Write a structure and sequence with these properties.
Energy-transfer acceptor. Its role is to transduce the blue chemiluminescence of the protein aequorin into green fluorescent light by energy transfer. Fluoresces in vivo upon receiving energy from the Ca(2+)-activated photoprotein aequorin. With 230 residues, the chain is mainly beta. The chain is built from 2 helices and 11 strands. The protein has one domain: Green Fluorescent Protein (Beta Barrel). It starts with a helix and ends with a strand.
Length: 230
Amino acid sequence: DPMVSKGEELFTGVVPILVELDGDVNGHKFSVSGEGEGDATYGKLTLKFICTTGKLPVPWPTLVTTFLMCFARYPDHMKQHDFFKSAMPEGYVQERTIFFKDDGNYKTRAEVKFEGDTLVNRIELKGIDFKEDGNILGHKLEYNYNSHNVYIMADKQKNGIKVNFKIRHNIEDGSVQLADHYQQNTPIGDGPVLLPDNHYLSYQSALSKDPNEKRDHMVLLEFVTAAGIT
């Protein structure tokens, strides 16, 4: 399939990644840069993020979803359902609203695209209605992360996809902070794209710290595999 060949041919080896985020949560401003690499053959991403403005005013884990679904491993039987790659190199727009239960919300807009050989994820994040002493602005979320299925459906009328999922962030007292994600993706280009049958992506995420890093930061290792169409 000459289509499966193209956007796909972009992802067959290891691909450098750049991430840039401009954040304002309750008038708390911040910027984050990230660098790393994706190997979609194995559904694998390794990135390190740095708050370049000092202290991150929210928990790092609250940002993991926002900080690259084109790096999912789609099984051979499922290649015709990989929207993310199909949109490349021109890229796509990924927009979210993420509702933190009993707290504020983030609204994000991202452009995911190639800049030459580098895959680039440019983000703007606005958070509003947060509690200064909640689990988010009060930094009460543990530095870890649970595995999660993400359910993808076609959005045929917007020539793109809808993604819907919940993330439970562990709180220090042992309870959980629910973060309800609503997502929409649309191609940046005017060309054809693969619009998938309902399926899901399985996410495993591991959060760590660089022992030689003084700045406020996050090392993220994600494995992501498409499933749910046998």
